[PDB]
Amino acid sequence: STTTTGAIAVTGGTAVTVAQTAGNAVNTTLTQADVTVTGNSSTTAVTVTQTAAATAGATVAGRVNGAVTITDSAAASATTAGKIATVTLGSFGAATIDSSALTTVNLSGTGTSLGIGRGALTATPTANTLTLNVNGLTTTGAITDSEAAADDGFTTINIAGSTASSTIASLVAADATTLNISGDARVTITSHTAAALTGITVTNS
Amino acid sequence: GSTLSLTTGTDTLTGTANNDTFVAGEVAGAATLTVGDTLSGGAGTDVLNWVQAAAVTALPTGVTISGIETMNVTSGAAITLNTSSGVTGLTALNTNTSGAAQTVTAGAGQNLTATTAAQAANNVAVDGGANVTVASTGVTSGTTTVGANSAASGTVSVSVANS
Numbered sequence: 001s002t003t004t005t006g007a008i009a010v011t012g013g014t015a016v017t018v019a020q021t022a023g024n025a026v027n028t029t030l031t032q033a034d035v036t037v038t039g040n041s042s043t044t045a046v047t048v049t050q051t052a053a054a055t056a057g058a059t060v061a062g063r064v065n066g067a068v069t070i071t072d073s074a075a076a077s078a079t080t081a082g083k084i085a086t087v088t089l090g091s092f093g094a095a096t097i098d099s100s101a102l103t104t105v106n107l108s109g110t111g112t113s114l115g116i117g118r119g120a121l122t123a124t125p126t127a128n129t130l131t132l133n134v135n136g137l138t139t140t141g142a143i144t145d146s147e148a149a150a151d152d153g154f155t156t157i158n159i160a161g162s163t164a165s166s167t168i169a170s171l172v173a174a175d176a177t178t179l180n181i182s183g184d185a186r187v188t189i190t191s192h193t194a195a196a197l198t199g200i201t202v203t204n205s
Numbered sequence: 206g207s208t209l210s211l212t213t214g215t216d217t218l219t220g221t222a223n224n225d226t227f228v229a230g231e232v233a234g235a236a237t238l239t240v241g242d243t244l245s246g247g248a249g250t251d252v253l254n255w256v257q258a259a260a261v262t263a264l265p266t267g268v269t270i271s272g273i274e275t276m277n278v279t280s281g282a283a284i285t286l287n288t289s290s291g292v293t294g295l296t297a298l299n300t301n302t303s304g305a306a307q308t309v310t311a312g313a314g315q316n317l318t319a320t321t322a323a324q325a326a327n328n329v330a331v332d333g334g335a336n337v338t339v340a341s342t343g344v345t346s347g348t349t350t351v352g353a354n355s356a357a358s359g360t361v362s363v364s365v366a367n368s
């Protein structure tokens with residue numbers, strides 16, 4: 001259809017995958033579905049794939065991407081652990097994650113914004129390494145560490161570009177200290193906002 | 206395709222993605238294109254037929270037409286409508302009077318055709334659109350006037366008959 005894909009919501013499960021596609025005609029625009037996943041305390045991983053965005057052309061099928069909202073159980077807790085460790089995205093609109101157990105984000109295809117929050121745990125976190133594997137990723141806007149601003153963000157960000165070029169329009173990580181860009185294919189960061197950075201280290205081929 | 210009827214209420218109608226036709230007639234002599242009506246087409250054989258005894262006055266508040274290729278508007282009195290907004294995906298707008306004024310503005314991308322019988326001292330005025338066509342008969346005093354506020358994307362084709 002050209003009429004837009006209606007919500008998708010999941011609550012609970014050991015691992016969640018929601019895989020949208022868009023198969024609309026060559027001169028139309030379908031805008032895809034807003035996704036919400038909310039883990040229960042068994043939810044280790046979440047994956048939310050969509051069809052890549054494109055501009056409606058003569059022979060180009062048009063797609064806009066749906067917002068994604070991922071939330072762990074213990075996102076609002078002061079003490080409870082948190083279970084969502086890995087999140088995989090394959091295209092996205094205005095995406096959010098909120099997990100104090102989050103270490104890895106896998107990015108892919110066409111994105112608008114990612115906002116990463118960690119759980120509102122009052123305890124000072126000791127492991128503060130965001131692994132950010134990219135592959136064919138392009139961003140309209142910002143990957144932000146929402147937690148860093150008023151709370152305890154990631155101190156070291158690692159970006160591993162893989163098999164295809166990636167472009168992050170803006171990377172905002174106010175508690176970041178080290179930044180290591182690694183791997184296999186170009187990573188481009190059009191604009192970083194990371195005032196506390198003491199070093200940047202490219203190891204990428 | 207399938208055939209969908211508007212009511213005197215607020216309608217939320219969605220086509221089959223096929224040869225479907227949308228009827229916006231009268232019910233007890235009460236108009237069926239009314240405030241908040243939202244219409245949606247699908248595939249490219251989509252027609253909206255709007256017929257009213259009463260003068261067409263504007264598009265009514267909150268009305269949105271989308272994915273519908275041909276819009277036919279017929280009134281027992283005057284037509285005044287603008288279709289540069291609310292309406293998207295419209296290739297062809299046809300407006301029909303007999304014995305009263307016309308004041309129409311189309312979005313570019315839309316082929317306007319303003320047919321008027323017995324025009325007499327009434328004035329036709331049209332604006333915008335892709336190809337425009339004015340077809341006026343029984344004319345007398347009536348001005349015919351095109352693109353005074355906004356030109357056509359494509360061709361103008363006026364024709365005017367007087368007895």
Ligand SMILES: [Ca+2]
Pocket residue numbers: 117118119120147151
């Ligand atoms: Ca927080």
Ligand SMILES: [Ca+2]
Pocket residue numbers: 120121122123151152
């Ligand atoms: Ca805290």
Ligand SMILES: [Ca+2]
Pocket residue numbers: 147148149150151152153175
């Ligand atoms: Ca801080």
Ligand SMILES: [Ca+2]
Pocket residue numbers: 211212213214215216237238239242
């Ligand atoms: Ca109605």
Ligand SMILES: [Ca+2]
Pocket residue numbers: 206220221222223224225246247248249250251
């Ligand atoms: Ca249809």
Ligand SMILES: [Ca+2]
Pocket residue numbers: 246247248249250251272273274
């Ligand atoms: Ca259609």
